[PDB]
Amino acid sequence: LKNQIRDARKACADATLSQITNNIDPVGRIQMRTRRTLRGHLAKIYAMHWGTDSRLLVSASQDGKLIIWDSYTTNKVHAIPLRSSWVMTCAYAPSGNYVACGGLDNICSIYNLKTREGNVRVSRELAGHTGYLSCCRFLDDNQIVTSSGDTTCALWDIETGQQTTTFTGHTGDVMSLSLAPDTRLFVSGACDASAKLWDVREGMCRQTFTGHESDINAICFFPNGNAFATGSDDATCRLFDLRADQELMTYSHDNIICGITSVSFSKSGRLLLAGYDDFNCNVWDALKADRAGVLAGHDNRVSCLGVTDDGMAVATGSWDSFLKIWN
Amino acid sequence: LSAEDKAAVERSKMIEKQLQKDKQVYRATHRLLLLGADNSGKSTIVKQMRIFETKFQVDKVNFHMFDVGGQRDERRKWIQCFNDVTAIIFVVDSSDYNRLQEALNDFKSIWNNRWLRTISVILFLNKQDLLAEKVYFPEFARYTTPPRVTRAKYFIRDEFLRISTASGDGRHYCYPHFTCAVDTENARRIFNDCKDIILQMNLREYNLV
């Protein structure tokens, strides 16, 4: 009955985004410069996350180190040795008293920073997943949503240490997830060239979006929570609307033949920042599908990319062992 | 220049000193990725010289091998983690001719991957005692040695080396070794071949290549 779904999606398609936004003033050529270069990690950066306080960020590297930086002063607040050097995700708690990570160990390890006269130690270890841990995001100090390479996502209880609900209907390894601003839903993009919208309370899939052509690598919710973007291996970013249940934009240009590693939006949502495997990053007009800027400062591969909560800066880590703050 | 700020810079300085101390020992050790099929018997080589982590030291140089097997059979995504390894170890069941095609295609996909094109591969044809007693591919009729067990072992090695030399030039190399079931010298092999690999990178950065 997928033909009926395609017909229903076609029936509601009456104004393309390229047509309804053809009389909108284009933004200027976005020229951003590096402000800080973070130079303390030994090997390639794999992930990064921003603190809610918009000053502190955590990062992960191939050398099995978890460094918490002070972006204003470039000073390392923490340097946490991990039991496994193979990690791919970082999570900063909204309260700021916890940090999580994970990877090929298939375990989300949680580290308590605000200890009593003691260094940072592993507070908990969540060990119910089967495939490699791809992404994790704190809901609060006691709940964390995790995705892995066993084609499943799970919501955990940190105090008890076992899963509360599991989001099992998916094909291919789930590569990224993005929490809604209301924290009641989340979208996950996997390696089956599809993305799904999940309900945290109900534990069921409500929508599926199958516009892309290859493995989806990054996913980011729109600031109002009514849309999201997906960066995939087909060298194309696309924009999907939850209400319309169809793709709206396709941020694809010729001479781009590399996959998108990271995807993030600005505070207003006008700019879509996408990291690429062609050593550099791109700035996209979200409602015009035209290039607006390039962050060409990295040397090996832009693996992670995040925009600050207040939107004052964008931090992009890279495979050259350096993080960069842009403005 | 406040007291709290000065304490923050002092703590960052101590952290950076510890980071330099860790960098001293991180570059002095070598990471090895262990790959192969289920019947390859790679764990036999692991236990002889000892996600499973195996640490051993040869000539006071520390090697650390990783046998990741807690995953699914779709490895196009998590194999990018083993990008800065000194070498990839491939273990092949040379005595089970049914699966040599899949092993050859696996080595071919490892060879031509964009994220593994600069990483050298050490090859171990493991089950050689079973191959000798035992003795599909139609090239064995016209193949000539560069008894028949020598022809078979060097023919499989030549198939692997043909795939290796078909596309990999000047960035990474293949090292075929003929492993046995009760070999006690694969640590020396891994040491010498990692030594050759680092010598090749040295010659590249010394502008001599």
Epitope: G172, A193, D234, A235 | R76, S109
Partner: nanobody, 126 residues
């Protein structure tokens, strides 16, 4: 939605000949490397053929060379496996497979137990 649909699966004597054609849809045909994936009663997932995006590089399994010549049509979005020298040891289910990424001949995960960009398959019985 990446959809691949095959055809041309019917009972054939040890002699004779047959042809398989997979009709690709939902993606750009000419940017990807494609292959042929074989099954059998009570064994795993095999690998028969291979062709590049341009069509200038062809690889075969050691037991299919000279008998299972292939073709592709970037204009018609089709890929073929012309079967001419059949044997009774060829009863299989044939899936038209695809490399995970464009400009990428990795096809790292083509013959996996679960693969997203693989067709449903046609039973070729003998």
């Amino acid at each position: 939605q990446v959809q691949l649909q095959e055809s041309g699966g019917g009972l054939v004597q040890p002699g004779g000949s047959l042809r398989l054609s997979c009709a690709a849809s939902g993606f750009t045909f000419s940017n990807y490397k494609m292959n042929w994936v074989r099954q059998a009663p009570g064994k795993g997932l095999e690998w028969v053929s291979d062709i590049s995006q341009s069509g200038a590089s062809i690889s075969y399994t050691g037991s299919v060379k000279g008998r299972f010549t292939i073709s592709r049509d970037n204009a018609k979005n089709t890929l073929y496996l012309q079967m001419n020298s059949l044997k009774p040891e060829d009863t299989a289910v044939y899936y038209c497979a695809r490399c995970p990424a464009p400009f990428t001949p990795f096809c790292f995960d083509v013959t996996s137990t679960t693969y997203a960009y693989r067709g449903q398959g046609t039973q070729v019985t003998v």
